[PDB]
Design a protein around this ligand. Structure first.
Ligand SMILES: Nc1nc2[nH]cc(CN[C@H]3C=C[C@H](O)[C@@H]3O)c2c(=O)[nH]1
Ligand SMILES: [Zn+2]
Ligand SMILES: [Zn+2]
Lengths: 366, 389
């Protein structure tokens, strides 16, 4: 149940209900995870971060190769990885490490985890989801269309969508799981509208806007707003591969609700800390730089995360130079806290009608 | 007119040498016997100050040689000492900087002036005198500092053993004279003398004439036989003052710990099994990379209160060891430190409750089985202090 509050300049402010029956604020982001954990964080350290999303993103690519053990476990992936109190959306691909392209046919899609290619027909896909038991999952889809190749991306995804719906209708396990429809069609306007209008015909719980990643062209942004125009209002709109703050804001203006949070993880992995301001009148610093060796300030003055309240730039610099994993822990805590705080500021700006100002504040720092 | 004692004894076993005490240190009182993890081992594996505190750690080690390289003593000075640099509020113990974690390829021969470091590719050498070792540890600001000693392997023989032992006495005196603020840091002597009972006896007799707040037992755990190991430990505790702490360096195996507590030791350190996938348990260890754990959905130890055992299954740890090894190594290191701290907490509770002999018998029974299956040296060491199995 998606209940809106306002649509200020095409931006959807609201909350999703009946999830138990937990809730998720929109616009918002999903907690990014790799192979069943928020990277470098635990239950304890995650509890201190403020504004943690209600729902966490898992990827088939990192879990598919663990099918056997999970089916034996029976109680689903959330319980298996030790955080059963959380909601999980299971997408097909990891946004950071998607794997080699060109293995999609009208009959199977392949993902790569730590080991070897896991090729999945519809049956195998649904059999894996029966073991994972996520609350939401992306339906199997062809997102590799990037003219005649775009027509196929729609039809394969339509074919996968209806087969998965059939199998879900007769699977007791997947009854309480919500399928997300996937809009394809690549960069061909005609197919995007077709995928949009045809996927909406089916009773999916939400929509995934696939193939809009950057390298984000204003051409793609036009397709995006044209696609969201064909989509109903009462259903959530997710997007994949869009996480940088300026891109997030462009997509929110065009009706997109939910975002992946892989951006703060990427910042962490290169030894960097988010510093961009998101409240009042450079977006990151590289803690490996020698200028931080004697800098005893926190990463961000006034930040409330455990890293900033209790550790210095100097210390984190040292930890990176000696490759201690505590560096990645403290950077992940700060970067997630900063990024979730950024989304809190978006929802507050929408409430107060100041999103245009926040966009200029973000875009002058990126 | 001796110096004030930093330890008080709260209970003693009537048969054995087991002691339960408290160390009144500038960053808090520490219950003994105590296992002291290396702080950088935990942080290298992503363990925070909060997590290490949460496990019950109240004193941990800093490695002076490594800290002297990165970030260096001057920077730790500007950072307000090691406590401020790493944001650690409890106690710290640092070594002299001349031996621990120093590669033999990096050392030239010891002289009376001190230890000599070599720099790569025929570069110039660096001296570490006893006076400079104390000054470095003054800058680190740790609560316990160790004398600079002349360390030789426990399996070296010949005149070098006696030579190094006597130089260690002389360097002790120089460290005492250099340490101008015993009201702020506690300097410990280190007994040497190898496996030579006469040399170690001499080192014990002479070093205890120096009024330092505590005594460590060095030179052991370097490949000697177990027969010789425990007899040297017992020789040492028989001559170290009862009213000061006994710190046994480089002993961390659970069975060794329990036996050495029974011989009268108070503090322990040891360096790492988590990298092989091993989880410490009361029957020894679990090798979680083995296929038999792939579908084992129970925790490492249902009675372990560590965050790994209250959150995760063997099956999940087994999957991560393969798929996300860095993450698994965090979880295993947290549990392995927890196990060591819980072992010593349980040891301490048994001495306060006057049931240490029964605790040892339960420990050995769980760890080995019948008396015949227990290590022969441990049976003999324990029998020498009235604990029969
Ligand atoms: N300074 C100092 N640090 C120390 N750490 C551990 C020990 C005791 N065990 C080491 C010494 C000799 C053995 O071969 C073993 O390698 C020690 C010491 O005797 N002196
Ligand atoms: Zn912060
Ligand atoms: Zn545990």
């Amino acid at each position: 149940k998606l209940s809106l509050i306002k649509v200020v300049n095409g931006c959807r402010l609201g909350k999703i209900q009946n999830l138990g029956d937990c809730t998720v604020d929109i616009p918002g982001c999903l907690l990014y995870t790799r192979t069943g954990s928020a990277p470098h964080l635990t239950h304890q350290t995650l509890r201190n971060i403020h504004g943690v999303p209600g729902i966490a993103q898992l990827t088939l690519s990192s879990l598919a190769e663990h099918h056997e053990v999970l089916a034996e476990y029976k109680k689903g992936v959330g319980s298996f990885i030790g955080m059963p109190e959380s909601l999980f959306y299971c997408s097909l691909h990891d946004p950071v490490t998607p794997g080699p392209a060109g293995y999609v046919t009208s009959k199977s899609v392949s993902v790569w985890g730590f080991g070897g290619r896991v090729e999945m027909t519809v049956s195998k896909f649904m059999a894996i989801q029966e073991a994972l038991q996520p609350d939401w999952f992306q339906c199997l889809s062809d997102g590799e269309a990037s003219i005649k190749r775009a027509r196929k991306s729609v039809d394969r995804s339509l074919l996968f969508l209806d087969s998965c719906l059939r199998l879900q209708e007769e699977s007791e396990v997947l009854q309480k799981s919500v399928i997300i429809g996937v809009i394809e069609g690549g960069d061909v306007m005609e197919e995007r509208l077709r995928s949009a209008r045809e996927t909406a015909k089916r009773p999916v719980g939400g929509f995934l806007l696939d193939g809009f990643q950057g390298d984000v062209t204003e051409t793609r942004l036009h397709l995006l707003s044209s696609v969201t125009a064909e989509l109903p209002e009462d259903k959530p709109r997710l997007i994949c591969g869009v996480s940088r703050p300026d891109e997030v804001l462009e997509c929110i203006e065009r009706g997109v609700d939910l975002f992946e949070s892989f951006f703060p993880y990427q910042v962490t992995e290169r030894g960097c800390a988010l510093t961009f301001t998101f409240d009042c009148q450079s977006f990151e610093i590289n803690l490996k730089e020698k200028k931080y060796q004697e800098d005893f300030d926190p990463l961000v003055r006034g930040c409330s995360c455990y890293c900033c309240k209790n550790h210095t730039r100097a210390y984190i610099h040292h930890l990176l130079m000696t490759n201690e994993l505590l560096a990645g822990v403290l950077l992940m805590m700060h970067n997630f806290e900063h990024y979730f705080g950024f989304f809190c500021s978006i929802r507050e700006a929408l409430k107060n009608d100041t999103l245009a100002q926040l966009k200029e504040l973000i875009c002058r720092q990126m | 007119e001796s110096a004030p004692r930093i330890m008080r004894l709260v209970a003693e076993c009537s048969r054995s040498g087991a002691r339960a005490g408290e160390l009144r240190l500038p960053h808090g009182t520490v219950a003994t016997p105590v296992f002291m993890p290396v702080g950088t081992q935990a942080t290298m594996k992503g363990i925070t100050t909060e997590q290490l505190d949460s496990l019950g750690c109240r004193i941990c080690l800093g490695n002076t040689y490594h800290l002297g390289l990165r970030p260096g003593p001057e920077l730790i000075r500007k950072a307000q000492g090691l406590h401020g640099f790493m944001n650690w509020p409890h106690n710290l113990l640092t070594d002299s900087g001349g031996f621990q974690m120093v590669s033999l390829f990096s050392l030239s021969e010891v002289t009376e002036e001190g230890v000599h470091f070599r720099s790569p590719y025929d570069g110039e050498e660096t001296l570490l005198s006893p006076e400079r070792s104390v000054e470095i540890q003054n800058a680190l600001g740790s609560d316990i500092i160790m004398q600079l000693d002349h360390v030789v392997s426990s399996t070296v023989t010949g005149p070098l053993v006696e030579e190094a032992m006597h130089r260690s006495v002389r360097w002790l005196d120089r460290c005492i004279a250099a340490h101008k603020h015993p009201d702020k840091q506690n300097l410990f002597a280190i007994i040497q003398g190898g496996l030579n009972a006469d040399l170690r006896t001499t080192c014990l007799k002479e070093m205890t004439k120096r009024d330092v707040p505590g005594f460590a037992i060095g030179g052991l755990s370097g490949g000697e036989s177990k027969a010789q190991f425990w007899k040297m430990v017992a020789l040492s505790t028989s001559m170290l003052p009862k009213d000061k702490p006994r710190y046994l360096m480089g002993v961390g195996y659970a069975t060794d710990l329990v036996v050495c507590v029974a011989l009268g030791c108070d503090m322990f350190d040891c360096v790492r099994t988590a990298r092989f996938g091993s989880a410490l348990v009361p029957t020894g260890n679990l090798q979680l990379k083995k296929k038999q754990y792939a579908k084992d959905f129970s925790p490492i130890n249902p009675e372990c209160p560590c965050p790994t055992c209250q959150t995760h299954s063997r099956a999940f740890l087994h999957a991560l060891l393969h798929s996300d090894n860095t993450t698994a190594l965090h979880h295993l290191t947290v549990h392995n430190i927890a196990y060591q701290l819980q072992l010593l907490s349980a040891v301490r509770s048994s001495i306060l409750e006057q049931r240490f002999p029964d605790f040892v018998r339960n420990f050995m029974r769980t760890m080995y089985g019948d008396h015949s299956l227990c290590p022969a040296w441990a049976v003999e060491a324990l029998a020498s202090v009235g604990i029969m199995l």
